[PDB]
User: Fold Ribosome-associated protein L7Ae-like from Bacillus subtilis.
Amino acid sequence: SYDKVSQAKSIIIGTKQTVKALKRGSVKEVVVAKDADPILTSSVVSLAEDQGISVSMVESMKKLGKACGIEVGAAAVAIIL
RNA sequence: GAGUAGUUCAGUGGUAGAACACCACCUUGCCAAGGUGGGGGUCGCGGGUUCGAAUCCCGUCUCGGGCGAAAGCCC
RNA sequence: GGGUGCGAUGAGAAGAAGAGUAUUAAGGAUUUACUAUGAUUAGCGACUCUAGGAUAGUGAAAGCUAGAGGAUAGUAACCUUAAGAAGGCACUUCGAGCACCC
Ligand SMILES: [Mg+2]
Ligand SMILES: [Mg+2]
Ligand SMILES: [Mg+2]
Ligand SMILES: [Mg+2]
Ligand SMILES: [Mg+2]
Ligand SMILES: [Mg+2]
Assistant:
């Protein structure tokens, strides 16, 4: 769902920043890219589900980057609405 | 002429030097830098000369080049 | 503006380390190791001693190997005092630029 990502009010970018966004429950929707290494994805989606927050996985992470406006690509993006 | 420490170069008859690299400690999450120490070389290989050969001689191996009809020879 | 490289699998900055460590002095201790050097005189060549080596010549004493032990300095290693730094990854906040080139 890049409609939700390329828009939205507040969005944090990067697995660490999404984990820090989860660590204070200020995030409303969590987006995670599929073709990323699951070793890192696991830790953020687990904490996400544990918090009880919705997770919307997306196909491409380069596309995630492009939707965020970033030029390098992201693994996880948190929408801190 | 080219072949010498792991690499790169010195060493022009006295058992192989420097630099860098490597190991150990300093030392620690981890490396770099650094400071002490340390280990390492059929000197292409084999005979001879000599008390002693990386050095001289002979045979021989590989590479680059020169001479020669070639064998050889020279660098 | 152009050509690359890296970058949310974290650019970059600060912090935290590194650390009271390196380094700089004054003493202290005077045992360790390392380095340099060893009168005259022959000899290319000498810190001394033992054991093998090998040994032509020179010398009171030879070059190798293995030990052990020495003076003269120069160093590091250990205490006390006063000062006292430094790069990167990783870590911790901020989170997107940084680097080489013309
Ligand atoms: Mg011819
Ligand atoms: Mg021929
Ligand atoms: Mg950084
Ligand atoms: Mg820093
Ligand atoms: Mg401290
Ligand atoms: Mg120009």
Chain A is about 40% helix and 20% strand. Helices of chain A lie at 2-5, 15-22, 38-51, 61-68. The longest strand of chain A covers residues 29-33. Chain A has one domain: 1-81.
